[PDB]
């Protein structure tokens, strides 16, 4: 997927729901991880690891 155009519609709705699944500081970050894949549940998977990696003892 070299070109871009339809992704705008996905990220639009996806991000909207992200506000109800995770905070902005997270989404805004994870969004950089999957610049080609923007999903409500998918983004959750990445965050699950990102958080666990920065979890106290």
């Amino acid at each position: 997927g070299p070109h871009m155009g339809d992704l705008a519609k996905e990220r639009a709705g996806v991000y909207t729901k992200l506000c109800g699944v995770f905070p902005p500081h997270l989404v805004e970050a994870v969004m950089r991880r999957f610049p080609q894949l923007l999903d409500p549940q998918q983004l959750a998977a990445e965050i699950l690891s990102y958080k666990s990696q920065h979890l106290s003892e």
Side-chain angles (χ1 to χ4, degrees):
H3 59 239
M4 286 194 175
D6 314 312
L7 272 294
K9 182 70 81 190
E10 252 307 292
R11 202 173 69 175
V14 175
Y15 175 82
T16 309
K17 264 93 163 191
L18 260 304
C19 302
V21 189
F22 279 101
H25 91 273
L26 261 178
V27 181
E28 278 199 78
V30 185
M31 273 220 162
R32 186 264 147 168
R33 193 64 267 172
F34 283 61
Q36 74 179 116
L37 247 184
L38 280 303
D39 245 49
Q41 280 129 89
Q42 290 175 45
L43 285 163
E46 263 300 302
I47 300 156
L48 271 162
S49 160
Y50 177 57
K51 206 65 151 163
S52 165
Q53 279 229 129
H54 282 212
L55 193 70
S56 200
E57 308 85 71

